[model samples]
Target: MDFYQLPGSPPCRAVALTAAALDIEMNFKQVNLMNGEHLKPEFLKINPQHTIPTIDDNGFRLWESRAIMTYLADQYGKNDTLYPKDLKKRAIVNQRLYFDLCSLYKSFMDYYYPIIFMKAVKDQAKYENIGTALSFLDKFLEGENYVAGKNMTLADLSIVSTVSTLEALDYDLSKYKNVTRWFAKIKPEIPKYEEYNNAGLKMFK
Candidate 1:
């Protein structure tokens, strides 16, 4: 599989983490967004949108991190583990992935992107909105070992990538005890997690 991405991107990291969990080797092709490499005609031929985290799996192209995550799990997973074969469990994982993209990760970017990219002052309301999202995640994680169920799934990989980036930014996550506990427990369990995730985190830092 050919993976086109910048390692610092959360969506790209999510895909990388999924590949790591599935024990699949990726032909990582780094896209230099800062230099507009993604916008070049050659790259645009692959994905018109020129988005990072795009993949070409033996000429089958895919983008969108969540979709890519599920695809890897379905096609390459040794078993029905990361993404469940059962209906309800799979639904929950899908729901959590949407929640991460629409609510949790959205709130994170809303709060941080402006401050990071535009030199804008941090907005208290946006910061509080992140807490709102975290509250929901904490509630979902309560009495559950993982986001989807007892075993780790794509939801864990996707959301954990977001949370880990937030932690890298020094966001105060101490109050979300369930998330804190789940993160601490689940992170080290993923194969080569630190090597893959922490390496990207350095770029973010």
Candidate 2:
């Protein structure tokens, strides 16, 4: 599989973590967004959106980090563990994935992207939004070791990428007790966790 990505990106790291979880072999091609490589015609031919973490699996092109992780899990996972086969379990996994995309990750990006990219001042409202999203995640992880359930799922991989990125930014996550607990527990469980995720996170910092 040919994977287009910038390792420092959270979405790309999420896909990389899933690929590791499934033991999928991928040839990574780093996209230079700063150089406007993503906007070039050649890259646009593959994905009109020109987003990182796009993949071409023997000509089956795909984008969207969550969707790519789901596809990789379904097609390559040794068993239905990361994504699950049970209907209810799968549904919970899907819900958490959406939560990361729409709420948790969204809030983080909304608050930090401007500051990081445009050198804009932080907005108090946007900063509050991050706390709001984290509170929901803390509640979801109240008694569960993993986001979807007791077993680690694609949801955990996705959110872990985002949460770890937040951590890399020196964001104070200590107040979210359940999330902090879950983060500590899951870090060492992932295959090549440091290489596939943390290395990129450090680069992101």
Candidate 3:
């Protein structure tokens, strides 16, 4: 199995973390997004979208972090709990994963990316959007250990990966206690997380 990814990209990190949690071994290939390596012809052949976190297992090729994770769980996982077979349970998991994409990731990009990647403070509109996203997440996290339920699931992976990237970007998530706690819970589990501890370490660096 070949995994093409960058340590810093949230989506790529999500796939990597999921693989780690499942105890799946995959060959890691670093794609330097900062230098536009993903857009190179060779990578474009593997993933037309030129996105990091693309994978090749045997002859099958796949992209999209969440889809890759789901495929891994469904195809290779010895245990079913990681990606449950129950319809309701699966739906609940799917709901939270979607929430991460629709809300959490979007807000992180809005408030955190501009500050970290672009080196600018939060603007009025982005700050308001982030506020709304945080309020929604805080409410959703009430009385829950993980995003979908008591046990960890794909939802937790998605949320963790995105939030961790923001943390790396030096976003102050201390105000959101639930998020901070959840972040702490998942941080140690991700493979190679410590390798990128310093914010100045770029993918190439």
Candidate 4:
């Protein structure tokens, strides 16, 4: 299998981390998004949307971070625990994963992307927006060990990928104790998380 990715990208990192946790071996290919390689004709042929973190398993091609993670888990996982076998349990995990994509990831991008990637920290509105998002996350995290519950699932992996990027950009995560603790818990156990962090830490600095 060929996995096209950029290390610092949260979505790409999520897929990479999931594959590692499941012990799925893949050929990692670096796609330099910063240089616009994803938009080139060659890559467009593989993924018409022109996105990084795409996978080619034999003749099968896939994209989107969450979808790829789910596919990997369903296809390669030894047991159903990573994704869960029960109908209700799977539904719960799916709901949280959607929440992360729609709410958490969206909010984070609205705030952090402009400041960190676009270099617009001077924008007061963006700073305040980020704070608003953080406040929501703080509330969302109340009394929960993981996004879905006590067990680790794709939901946690997705959110962790986003939060880790903010940390790389020096966003003050210290304020969210629950988030901080949750991140610490997953960082070590998730496959290739350290390697992912090492690659990301240097990008923003």
For all predicted structures, in order, the TM-scores are 0.93, 0.93, 0.81, 0.84
Q: What digit string (tens of lDDT, one per residue) describes model 2 on residues 37-88?
A: 4376765555425567899999888989999999999999889879988899
Error of 1 at 131 (Å): 0.6
The local lDDT score (0 to 100) that residue 73 gets in candidate 2 is: 95
TM-score: model 1 vs. ground truth: 0.93
- The digit string of per-residue lDDT tens for model 3 on 98-154 reads 888888888777776676688787688886776677677777777777778667788
lDDT of 3 at 116: 62
Q: Given candidate 4, what's the lDDT at residue 45?
A: 61
Give RMSD (Å) of candidate 1 vs. truth. Answer: 2.0
Q: Report the Cα lDDT for residue 35, model 2.
A: 60
TM-score of 4: 0.84
Ranking by lDDT: 2, 1, 4, 3
Q: How many Å off is the CA of 104 in candidate 4?
A: 2.2
State the C-alpha lDDT per candidate. Answer: 0.88, 0.89, 0.74, 0.76
Q: Give the lowest summed-lDDT range of ten residues in model 1.
A: 42-51
**Per-residue lDDT of 1-205 in model 4, one digit per residue for the tens?**
9988877777887887788889889988876654564476765565424577789999788888889989999999988877997889888888878877776677667776676678775667655655666566666677876766557888778888888877876788888877787788778777777876547557754
Better of 2 and 3 by lDDT: 2
